[PDB]
Design a protein around this ligand. Structure first.
Ligand SMILES: CCCC[C@H](CC(=O)[C@H](CCCC)NC(=O)[C@@H](NC(=O)[C@@H](NC(C)=O)[C@@H](C)O)[C@@H](C)CC)C(=O)N[C@@H](CCC(N)=O)C(=O)N[C@@H](CCCNC(=N)N)C(N)=O
Lengths: 99, 99
């Protein structure tokens, strides 16, 4: 679809067998999801931005569907206000910025 | 232009008659630039990111040229790790996300 930027670009995703809303975020290298008990081997990571850093659990090769488009990759799990879909998954769905 | 997301969507902007590099950021409500000089009064504001909240200077109705495209809007100045063009100016240049 085409997603305008008048409001936050929130879409539905499916991850770990749960449906969630997430922000399509061209300013995020990685994908960060709210606290969720995903199965799998996870390892520690710190990620940063405005305000500093938070500790997250990194999971690899996690299947994620974004608005009906399948992706598979790394998801970081931690205490975020908004689920964030980053470029690692946005490229897999062929998302572009256009103007 | 159409911009893919294999690399960070960094572009050159012109602001207060000087050139800066910044990230086209659909995950940002607002436009935030590292410490730099702009004319006019500013208002103190707080904004939030992944790591917490920072204090910024809010400048209104600032002309900014983004990849050749003219916008006139609010620019926040403060200790962001990456200069970011957020939705307040992306909507002005008619940017959308597409997949
Ligand atoms: C969880 C909040 C949304 C997330 C985005 C993330 C973002 O824009 C930044 C942009 C680059 C760094 C400055 N990206 C990030 O912070 C991401 N960082 C990165 O991609 C990289 N790290 C760094 C240091 O660049 C890699 C190397 O890890 C991080 C999510 C890990 C993948 C962000 O910080 N948005 C802010 C930007 C500032 C702004 N004012 O626009 C925002 O919209 N803030 C709202 C928050 C509203 C919350 N309040 C509420 N809803 N009631 C606001 N107006 O303050």
């Amino acid at each position: 679809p085409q997603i305008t930027l008048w409001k936050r670009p929130l879409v539905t995703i499916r991850i770990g067998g749960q449906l969630k809303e997430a922000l399509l975020n061209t300013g995020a290298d990685d994908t960060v999801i709210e606290e969720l008990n995903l199965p799998g081997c996870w390892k520690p990571k710190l990620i940063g931005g405005i305000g500093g850093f938070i500790k997250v659990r990194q999971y690899d090769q996690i299947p994620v569907e974004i608005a009906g488009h399948k992706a598979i990759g790394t998801v970081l799990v931690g205490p975020t206000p908004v689920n964030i879909i980053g470029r690692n998954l946005l490229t897999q769905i062929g998302a572009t910025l256009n103007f």
